[PDB]
Amino acid sequence: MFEARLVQGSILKKVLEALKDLINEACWDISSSGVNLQSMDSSHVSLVQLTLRSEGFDTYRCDRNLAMGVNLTSMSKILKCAGNEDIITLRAEDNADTLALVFEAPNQEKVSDYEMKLMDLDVEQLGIPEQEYSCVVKMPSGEFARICRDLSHIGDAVVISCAKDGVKFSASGELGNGNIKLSQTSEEEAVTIEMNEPVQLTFALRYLNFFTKATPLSSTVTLSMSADVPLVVEYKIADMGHLKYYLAPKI
Amino acid sequence: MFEARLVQGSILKKVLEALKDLINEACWDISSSGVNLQSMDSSHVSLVQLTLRSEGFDTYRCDRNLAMGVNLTSMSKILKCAGNEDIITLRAEDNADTLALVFEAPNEKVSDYEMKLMDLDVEQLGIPEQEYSCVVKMPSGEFARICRDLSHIGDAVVISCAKDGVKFSASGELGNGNIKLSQTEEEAVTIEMNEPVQLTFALRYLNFFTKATPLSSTVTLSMSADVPLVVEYKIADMGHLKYYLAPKI
Amino acid sequence: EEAELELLRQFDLAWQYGPCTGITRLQRWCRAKQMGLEPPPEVWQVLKTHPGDPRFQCSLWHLYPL
Amino acid sequence: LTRAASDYAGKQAHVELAERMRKRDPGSAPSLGDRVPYVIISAAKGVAAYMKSEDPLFVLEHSLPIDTQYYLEQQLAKPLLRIFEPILGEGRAEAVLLRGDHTRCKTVLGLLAFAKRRNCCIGCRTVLSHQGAVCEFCQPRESELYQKEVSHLNALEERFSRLWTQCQRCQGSLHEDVICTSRDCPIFYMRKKVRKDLEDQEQLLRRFGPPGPEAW
Amino acid sequence: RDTKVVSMVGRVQMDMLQVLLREYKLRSYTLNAVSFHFLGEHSIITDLQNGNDQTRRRLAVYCLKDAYLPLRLLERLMVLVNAVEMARVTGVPLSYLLSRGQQVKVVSQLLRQAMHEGLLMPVVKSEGGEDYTGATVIEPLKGYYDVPIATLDFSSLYPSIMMAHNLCYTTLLRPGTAQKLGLTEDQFIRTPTGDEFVKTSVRKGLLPQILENLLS
DNA sequence: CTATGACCATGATTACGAATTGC
DNA sequence: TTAAGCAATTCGTAATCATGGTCATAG
């Protein structure tokens, strides 16, 4: 019998708002470690790993290793019917293939109790490698979204150069060439480019716009890259766990 | 000759944006008791009833009972050429089919428009007064969000008035949900009940009815057995505005 | 009943009481009695042991847009 | 109603009326090769003129309204613009669309059952409490407003009598009832509406009092 | 059209509905509508029959008037006299003019003209050739005219083309059989599509003679 | 709270397929 | 086994494009 609570519950609205434009479905793996989601993209370029530990929740009862599937955009349309101060509660029976959502109010006067049906899933599942990421950058999320959207009006795909002094976000386009340079700044607005060996890579800027949909989702964004590997953007879901978006690189 | 003058033109603009989507043509029954109107919608489903009493107009003058025929789209386009602080006067002859509107800014700028009326052959209907047995007084913002939020799921809604509170339920292909409300100044939800009610109404009409939300803070919903649900608003020392909608069988 | 509904249907088509498809049944019964043609005292005695039912107190074709 | 597959290929109005049976009779319906008659009623489904078609006898017995704008802009208007243009210019299109415009401004027409029978002034159309016909501002001109409309009752009375005695001569007999619901006769259903016109126009003049006593 | 038939040997059937539906193009094909167009005019019946005997007498007079109207239409419209003259001019029986089309009659007349010179007909069947080019229309000078225009036309155009240039099956010249004879002048002619056809000083066709009989 | 951008629909116009009539 | 032909005007119906209006998000 799964029954879980979340008081600062705006984060679920915030993650599924940054989930539904990417992918149409999700493989929700409920374990005693909490709520998890590994899922590929639809274009066979990217992946989402959501991890929600139990210690980031309030009140918890998990009796089953549930492995269910959610059609995301209808669930997001249901999640659009509750405010952000409102408490989010989930209830689930291991025989009744439905989700019972309970939206409590902070003043407790408006009660919501919605139900979404289940559909079967046989989703593919691959494991991420663990390795050394030659460049890990801590950045403000709003500035990062601002920069990549400022590059979106030049061209389509981005080339990155990650080195010691500055980092080089370059692009071409139908109006010519452009590039912006960044450096370390000597807690949320601090940046850090931790680097061992400088690299150059190609990535898709449109998938950076897709990844910056989680701009309000953390204190800071982390950008982890190495040679010829999936970029992992990290949004540390505060006190809860973390969301990591993998992007397999380009050739 | 008719001539009225009112200091708060904002009330006039809110009432004219209540109705420009549901109605295309109307007839104003100008009398020596005020400005009163009844109309049916274009779909022949719902009733509107609007009363602006004679006192609240701060300079009134009406010689003879008139009847003006107004295309509400052109009038709604004219009343958005007037800012939210102006003072509005209406000028009409008793021999003419053309109305004059003069907007007076509270500072050097005055504006005056003339609009051609039309003759129409409509029939005027009304309502009889009976005691609806479920009486709800609730905040208007919550009602707007409740209707708009249930709207994405399906198109009907069932209203379920019980003792401590009321409960709205709605279904659809992506599931179902209800919202409760309980007895506990204007953010309260006062609930008077003699007999419990459960009824079904379609959502497009309710999302039309919640277009006039800036007119007041609270909204009054009245229900009874098998009668058209009444949605009622009050305008401060001016009058009221009522919509009427019949239940499904 | 089901025998009283054929007596009235027989009173309604006898030509010696009048050409009656515009009026009620008891009005035609009293019209013939005034002129005293020969109304029978049984088509009266079923129009008294009933209330205002539209399948006793109405002509055969009181539908029918003629 | 021709061969059924060409009318399967694309949705028409008469095919939709024919294939929709009635509740009264699933044994008399149009077959292949005959002609289906219909009229177009008013509704709010503007994408489809095949959703507004009805049998003439069904709209007779069930009294559905008529789409006067459909008949105005789709049946009438374009043949007239074929004929009337070549004698003049394009000010002739504006002349007939302006002769419409002086004449388009005169129209006549669940919750619909709960009518309060709101009475109205005969002079200036102002709804008001009480049953008297005239308005308090338009009371002096009442002899002229009675004069007006009794010449309308007089012309409805003259039309009732010319029609309901024509059926007696087309039937043969003067002493027995008329039974002829012939759908191809203009006589039928033109004899039905004058009863209601007279029913309505007789009751509008009882707003005025009686012209004398009757129990003397 | 899809009809049932019932077998009667010796006797002949003439439903007047099928004769109207084949010859005439009208708006409604009801007995009332064609009786007005040419002359000038179920649940009630079940209680006119369960009643008295003067009601049944009224029902019988109605039925006899119904059974009398098609006789009047048959003798007034000159149906049967024209059917007898059609069967005498074409040579087909009297039951074929209610069941068949216009092929059996031209087959019949061509066979009756073919026994007099000793020819046999072949069987060619093909599915299927292409279309050819039909008739010309001249481009108008559109408008309104108020000065008189006079109309001149040709009478019996295509049968007289087929008559006066000696065109037939039995005189169509194949492209090779003119060669290697070289006599072009007054032995054959040439058409705008391109064929060659023999002059009348060698052969007479069969379709000129059938057409000449029909024209007289 | 206001302004700008995006989406969504709705309406109008143009192009094609089909009952009837002219030949 | 059984069946004249073709040219169309013309209007209706369907699809596509354009234009604005409304709602939501960001500053």
Ligand SMILES: Cc1cn([C@H]2C[C@H](O)[C@@H](COP(=O)(O)OP(=O)(O)OP(=O)(O)O)O2)c(=O)[nH]c1=O
């Ligand atoms: C009406 C008709 C005409 N046509 C062709 C043949 C005709 O020679 C040509 C002229 O049409 P018509 O003028 O209609 O007929 P017609 O000229 O042969 O006889 P008349 O002048 O006495 O009325 O059109 C047909 O092929 N089939 C038809 O049904």
Ligand code: SF4
């Ligand atoms: S309705 Fe027409 S057809 Fe019928 S009896 Fe009267 S006049 Fe004759």
Ligand SMILES: [Zn+2]
């Ligand atoms: Zn008046």
